[PDB]
Amino acid sequence: VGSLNCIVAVSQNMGIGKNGDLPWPPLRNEFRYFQRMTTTSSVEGKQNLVIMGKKTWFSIPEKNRPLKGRINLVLSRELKEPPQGAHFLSRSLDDALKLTEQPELANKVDMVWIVGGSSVYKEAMNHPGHLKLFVTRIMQDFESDTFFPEIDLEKYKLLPEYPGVLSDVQEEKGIKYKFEVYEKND
Numbered sequence: 358v359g360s361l362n363c364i365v366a367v368s369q370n371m372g373i374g375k376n377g378d379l380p381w382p383p384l385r386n387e388f389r390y391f392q393r394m395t396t397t398s399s400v401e402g403k404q405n406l407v408i409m410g411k412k413t414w415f416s417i418p419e420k421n422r423p424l425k426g427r428i429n430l431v432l433s434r435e436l437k438e439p440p441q442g443a444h445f446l447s448r449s450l451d452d453a454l455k456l457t458e459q460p461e462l463a464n465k466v467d468m469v470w471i472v473g474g475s476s477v478y479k480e481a482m483n484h485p486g487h488l489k490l491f492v493t494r495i496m497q498d499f500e501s502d503t504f505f506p507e508i509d510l511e512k513y514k515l516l517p518e519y520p521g522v523l524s525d526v527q528e529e530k531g532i533k534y535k536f537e538v539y540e541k542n543d
C-alpha cells in the first residue's frame with residue numbers, strides 16, 4: 358500500500374464543521390481540489406482508499422455516497438456492517454490500516470486518505486510513521502462545533518511547495534484560502 362495522508366479544510370479558529378456541514382458557504386473549487394487530491398492515484402490498476410468516521414460519512418449528501426473512484430471505509434464501533442453505499446467498516450484506525458494488508462485490499466489500494474472527523478485526525482496525527490497533512494487554510498473565522506486538532510510543528514514540516522498544489526492565495530465567494538502540505542516522519 359502507498360502513502361498515508363490526512364486532508365482537511367480549516368478556518369482560522371480551527372473549525373472544520375458545524376452541525377454536520379461545513380462552517381463556510383460552499384467553495385466549489387475547494388471541493389474540486391479535495392476530490393482531485395483524494396481520487397488521483399500514483400499507481401495503475403489501483404484506487405486510493407478514504408477512511409472517515411461515521412458522522413463524516415453521513416455528512417456526505419445521500420445521493421453522493423460513496424465518494425466515486427475511491428474505496429470508502431467507515432470507522433464505527435456501533436455499526437455492524439458498512440452503511441448503505443460504503444465499502445468497508447472497521448472498528449478503529451489501527452484496524453483499518455491493518456485491513457489494508459489483507460488479501461482483499463493489499464493489491465487494490467494505493468494512497469490512504471483520512472478525511473475526518475476530529476478524533477480520527479487526532480489519532481492519525483499522533484501515530485508514528487511517515488504522514489502528510491494536506492490542509493486548506495480558510496483565512497476567516499467561522500462559527501464551528503467541531504475542530505481540527507493541534508498541528509505540532511516540531512514534527513510536521515510545512516513544505517515550501519508541492520506538485521499539483523497551487524501555492525498562491527485562492528478566493529471564492531469573497532473568502533480567501535490557501536493550500537498547504539505538511540510532512541512528518543517519526
Ligand SMILES: NC(=O)C1=CN([C@@H]2O[C@H](COP(=O)(O)OP(=O)(O)OC[C@H]3O[C@@H](n4cnc5c(N)ncnc54)[C@H](OP(=O)(O)O)[C@@H]3O)[C@@H](O)[C@H]2O)C=CC1
Nearest residue numbers: 365366374377378410411412413416434435449473474475
Ligand atoms: N475538512 C473539513 O472541513 C472536514 C469537515 N468534517 C465535518 O465534521 C463533521 C463530522 O465530524 P466528527 O463529529 O468529528 O465525526 P467523525 O466522522 O469522526 O465521526 C464520529 C463517529 O465515527 C466513529 N469513529 C470516529 N473515530 C473512530 C475510531 N477510531 N474508531 C471507531 N469509530 C470511530 C464513532 O462512531 P460510533 O459511535 O458508531 O463508534 C463516532 O460517533 C462532519 O459532519 C463534517 O461537516 C469532517 C471531515 C473534514
Ligand SMILES: CCCC/C(=C\c1coc2nc(N)nc(N)c12)c1ccccc1OC
Nearest residue numbers: 364365366379388391409416417472473493
Ligand atoms: C468525506 C468528506 C467530503 C468532503 C467534506 C469535507 C472535507 C473533508 O476533508 C476536506 N478537505 C478539503 N480540502 N476540503 C474539504 N471540504 C474537506 C464535506 C463533508 C460534508 C459536506 C461537504 C463537504 O465538502 C464540501
